[PDB]
């Protein structure tokens, strides 16, 4: 009905009154809408995932990299980042199988060892990373 927006839509359960047609956020942006034809309610959600941090051991030594997804549980990382909608080079770091779960989120591109050295490249929540032995 002229409301122009960009984001995924989901079936909602909000308790609209019969005379209402919008829904607003704390920042006062459109959040829920009602279909003009049939009386159903939709919740919107933006598509960017402000997010991922990148860990490198320095380009002067190696080009390998690791990625930390912040505050997202990595059972649903493919869904939350839209892995199937991106280039395969991103799907490589999405899939992983070198998947570690940390309090800060989920880390991909490194292996977890029991023995504990000093800290080399800080990460957080008590976890550090480093580049070594190939």
Partner 1 sequence: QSIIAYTMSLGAENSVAYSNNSIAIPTNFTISVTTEILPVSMTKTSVDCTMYICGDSTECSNLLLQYGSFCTQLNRALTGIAVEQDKNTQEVFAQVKQ
Partner 2 sequence: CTLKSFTVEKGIYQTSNFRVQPTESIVRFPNITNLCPFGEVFNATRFA
Partner 3 sequence: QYGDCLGDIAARDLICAQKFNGLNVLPPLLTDEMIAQYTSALLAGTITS
Ligand X SMILES: *[C@@H]1O[C@H](CO)[C@@H](O)[C@H](O)[C@H]1NC(C)=O
Ligand Y SMILES: *[C@@H]1O[C@H](CO)[C@@H](O[C@@H]2O[C@H](CO)[C@@H](O)[C@H](O)[C@H]2NC(C)=O)[C@H](O)[C@H]1NC(C)=O
Among positive and negative, which fits the CA dihedral 105, 110, 113, 116?
Answer: negative
Name the residues that contact partner 2, by CB under 8 A. Answer: 1, 6, 35-37, 47-50, 52-60, 68, 82, 85-86, 90, 120-123
Which of 10, 73 has the CB closer to ligand Y?
Answer: 73
**Dihedral (Cα; 58, 65, 130, 61), 10-degree rounding:** -30
Sign, Cα dihedral of 66, 71, 76, 81: negative
At closest approach, how far in Å is the CB of 134 from partner 3? 29
For residue 111, give the 3-state DSSP assignment.
Answer: coil
* Euclidean distance between CA atoms 60 and 36, whole angstroms: 58
Among positions 102-121, residues that touch ligand X (CB under 6 A) are 113-114
Nearer to partner 1, 42 or 104 (CB): 104
Give least dist CB 7 to partner 2, A.
10
Minimum distance of partner 2 from residue 55's CB (angstroms)? 5
Residue 66 belongs to what H/E stretch? strand 66-70
List interacting residues with partner 3 (CB under 8 A).
Answer: 13-14, 25-27, 31, 45-46, 50, 70-73, 76, 80, 103-104, 122, 124-126
């Amino acid at each position: 009905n002229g409301l122009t927006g960009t984001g995924v839509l989901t079936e909602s359960n909000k308790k609209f009154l019969p005379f209402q047609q919008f829904g607003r956020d704390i920042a006062d942006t459109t959040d829920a809408v009602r279909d003009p034809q049939t009386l159903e309610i939709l919740d919107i959600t933006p598509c960017s995932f402000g997010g991922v941090s990148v860990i490198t051991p320095g380009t002067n030594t190696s080009n390998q990299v690791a990625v930390l997804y912040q505050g997202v549980n990595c059972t649903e990382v493919p869904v939350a980042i839209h892995a199937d909608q991106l280039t395969p080079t991103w799907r490589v770091y999405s899939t992983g199988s070198n998947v570690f779960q940390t309090r800060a989120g989920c880390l991909i591109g490194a292996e977890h060892v029991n023995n504990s050295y000093e800290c080399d490249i800080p990460i957080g929540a008590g976890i550090c990373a480093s580049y070594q032995t190939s």
